[PDB]
Write a protein that binds this ligand. Sequence first.
Ligand code: ARG
Length: 554
Amino acid sequence: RPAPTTAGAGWDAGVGALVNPSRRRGGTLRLVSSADVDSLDPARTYYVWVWLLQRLLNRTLMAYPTDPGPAGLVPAPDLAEGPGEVSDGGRTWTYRLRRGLRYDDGTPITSDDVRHAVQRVFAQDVLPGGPTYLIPLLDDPERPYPGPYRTDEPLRSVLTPDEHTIVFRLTRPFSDFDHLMAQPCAAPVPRRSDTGADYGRDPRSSGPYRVARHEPDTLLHLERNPHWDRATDPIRPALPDRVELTIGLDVDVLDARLIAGEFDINLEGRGLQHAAQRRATADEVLRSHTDNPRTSFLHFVAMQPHIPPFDNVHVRRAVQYAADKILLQDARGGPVNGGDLTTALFPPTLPAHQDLDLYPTGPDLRGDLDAARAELAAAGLPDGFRAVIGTQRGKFRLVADAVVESLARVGIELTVKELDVATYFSLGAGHPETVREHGLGLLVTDWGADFPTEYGFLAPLVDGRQIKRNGGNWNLPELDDPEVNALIDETLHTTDPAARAELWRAVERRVMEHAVLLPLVHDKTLHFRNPWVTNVYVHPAFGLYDIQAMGLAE
Ligand SMILES: NC(=[NH2+])NCCC[C@H](N)C(=O)O
C-alpha cells in the first residue's frame, strides 16, 4: 500500500532512532537519484551520498557504526580487529587486520592493499576527485612520494610488518586518524587489480555488494559479493539480495515517484523539493513518513580582509550587527523550513558546541543598527561604504539579496556578483585569485565537514595552513592567525577529549572575535521514507539515511 494511504512510524521517527527494525533478508532495494555517481573508484569520490553507497561496496579499517545515536560519530573497527593503536604522542597509528577476508573475485585482502589504497591518493594526476587529508600527514617534504604508478618503492611512512598489520608514521600528531581510515579512499585496493584511471569501470569490492552494472546517467545495479563473510563484519547487515539505483530524474519527478512508492528511498538525499515539502508537511499521513534532521552543513557569509575595507575588524563587526537573521533565514526557506538559526559555527553534534554570540542582533534578531553604526564609526566609515557580495544563482542569490537589504539600513551599499554554480568551489568563491579579480569582500556559501569532528568541521574554514591558493579553498577570509593555528595543533596531540573540547571552544571564540565569518543557519532537510523499508535511520555522521542498513518488509 503506497505511503499516502497508510500511516508510518511518525514525524522524525528516524532521527535519533531506528524505524521498522528487521533482520529479514531478501528483495531488491529500489533507490533513486537525480545525479549519477561522481566515481565508482573509491578514491575518487567526494559526494556524501556516494560515500554512503560505498558502505555497501567496500570495507575499511574503521567504519562508522550502524547506530542512530551519538556513538554513530565514533569510528568502529571494521576490517581492523580494534581501533587504531596510538603511540608517539599521536604520531604513530597501528592497525591489525582480520585474517582470511576476501574480495569479490575470491582473492585475499592484505595490509599491502590498504597501503596501496593510501598510496593511490598521492597519484593526483591519475586519480583526482577524492579527499587528500592523508597526503600532508604521510608525505616526506624532503623526499616526496610520487604515487604508486611512478615508483614501486612503498611510501616510507607506511609499514606492513606482515600481511595483517599496518603502521602509519605521521608527520605530526593527528587525533582524528580513525576518521581518515573510515573514508572510502582508504578502502583496500589490491595492486594486482588496480587499472589506475580505469579502476571505476571494474573496481574490486570488499563489502557485501559488488557492482553488477553501471550505465552512465541511467542506472547502477549491485549484487551480493559471494565472498563477503557476514560472520566477520560487525557493521553491515546486508539484507537486500539486490540494490537497484535509478539515475537522472528531474528532482520533482523524483519526489513524485518516490512518494507514489515507485522507488523505496532517495539515495542522493538532497531532501524533498518545495512542492513535495508542502505536500508532505501538510498531510498527517505523509508527515508520519518524513524525517527532518540537521544535515550538519553550516550556511554562512565570509568576509575577506584582503578586500578593503574588510581588512578593518570594525567594518566586519558592523556587518555582523546589521545582519537581519530572520530575513536571512527566510531567504533560506525559513519562516518554517529555513534550517536552524545559529550565532556560532560548530554543529550541535560536536563536543565543542557552545553558547557564543559576540554580536547579538537585538531583541527581535533583526539587527542591532546602533551597534553597527558605532562599529562603522570605529572603522572611519560612519556613513557606510560600497562593496560587492559574491554568490551563486538560486538559493544563495536570495540570501545575498537579504544581505544587501540588511546592510543598506546602515549605509553599506552592496552590489551582487554571481558566479558559475558548477565551479563555485574550484574557480569561484573557492579560488583566491577570483575573489581578488572581482573584489568580493563578502561571499555566500555553505559547508559540511568531511568527517564529524571539530578539526574536520573548522580547520578547513579557518586554519592558515589550509588556504588553497590554486582553488578548492575553504578558508575564504584566508585567516592565518598563528594563535588559532597553534591552538588547532594543540588539539591534535591532546588525548583527553574534554581538554580537547575546551581548546576548540577557544579556537571558535577567537574566530568569532576576528568577525570574518557570519553564521546564518545550520541546515535541515526533509527525507521521505516508504513504510516497507526496514531499519531506516538518519546516520548522525552523514545527515542522510544509512542505506546499507536497510532491508525490505516481507
Ligand atoms: N564527503 C562529503 N562529506 N562530501 C560533502 C562535503 C564536501 C565539502 N566539505 C563541501 O562542503 O563541499
